[PDB]
Design a binder for this molecule. Structure first.
Ligand code: HEM
Length: 289
């Protein structure tokens, strides 16, 4: 099964920078969502969940086909709460109806990371909407109540190694958990991209508590929280080394995150030899907008 990228007809860098700007202006304007966190964190989670269905063994799932627009994937229990990200993007898609669904959902994640002062993430266009029958079944996204061995094994399906996994998990410095979405509650409610996930893991005094949904989570008196799969990164000696590396080197973390997140968003896609080079979008701030 091969998914060949095909550039939206006649479109070039300038077209996609217009779409980036539309998403970025809306992130700035619609600022009250989720108690003033804004939509940045949910758009990052959305880009990850539409990509995280990929299976390296048969090349099914992944961001290419934009299949989250179909009921089976939209209603996956693992995707509860992402409807808010979908509603945010819908008017953008109406304004630019030429962009494919996979391109829009993945570009939403790139725009959110950059506008939250994260690293630049190169991004390639040419995902093509595929039919409803290509939608992966539910149950490909990970559980949170597991240990390090589970996390490592899970991510082998997406062709990610230990450094890639620990870099990708740094996105958990953003946003919060919501009891009604996932059975977990709390978090720092942060909307600026930093390496604070690693600093908090190493520096806070974590307590294992049970929440109102009867699930265990790790809580600190500062108001931070970690899922069991987050805490597993300091229980496994290989993950722990890399957590310490990113707690001590913000630039290294930004560089490794950028590469792992681009790879996540591109898994399963074949880019022709004559495809355009990846784009690097300017932020609103760099444009003076
Ligand atoms: C073992 C892997 C992972 C598990 C089990 C996990 C699980 C979760 C859960 C349960 C939530 C809370 C959802 C809610 O209640 O609203 C969440 C939030 C989030 N996750 Fe993950 N996740 C994982 C990996 C990742 C990765 C790789 C990224 C992105 C690179 C990501 C980005 C996010 C973001 C940004 C949020 C906050 C969303 C918001 O504030 O609305 N996660 N995750």
């Amino acid at each position: 099964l091969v998914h060949v990228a095909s550039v939206e007809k006649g479109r070039s860098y300038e077209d996609f920078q217009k779409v980036y700007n539309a998403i970025a202006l809306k992130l700035r304007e619609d600022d009250e969502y989720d108690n003033y966190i804004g939509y940045g964190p949910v758009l990052v989670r959305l880009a990850w969940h539409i990509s995280g269905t990929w299976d390296k063994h048969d090349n099914t799932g992944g961001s290419y086909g934009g299949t989250y627009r179909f009921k089976k994937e939209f209603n996956d229990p693992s995707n509860a709460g992402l409807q808010n990200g979908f509603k945010f993007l819908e008017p953008i898609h109406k304004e630019f109806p030429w962009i494919s669904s996979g391109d829009l959902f993945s570009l939403g994640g790139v725009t959110a990371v950059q506008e939250m002062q994260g690293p630049k993430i190169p991004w390639r266009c040419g995902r093509v909407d595929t039919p409803e029958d290509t939608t992966p079944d539910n149950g490909r996204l990970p559980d949170a109540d597991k240990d390090a061995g589970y996390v490592r094994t899970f991510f082998q399906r997406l062709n990610m190694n230990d450094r890639e996994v620990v870099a990708l998990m740094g996105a958990h410095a953003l946003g919060k958990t919501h009891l009604k979405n996932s059975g977990y509650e709390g978090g720092g409610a942060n909307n600026v991209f930093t390496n604070e996930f690693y600093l908090n893991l190493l520096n806070e005094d974590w307590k294992l508590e049970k929440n109102d949904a009867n699930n265990e989570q790790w809580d600190s008196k500062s108001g931070y929280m970690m899922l069991p799969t987050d805490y597993s990164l300091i229980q496994d000696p290989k993950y722990l080394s890399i957590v310490k590396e990113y707690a001590n080197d913000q630039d290294k973390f930004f560089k490794d995150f950028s590469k792992a997140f681009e790879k996540l968003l591109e898994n399963g896609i074949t880019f022709p030899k004559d495809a355009p080079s990846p784009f690097i979008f300017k932020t609103l701030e760099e444009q003076g907008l």
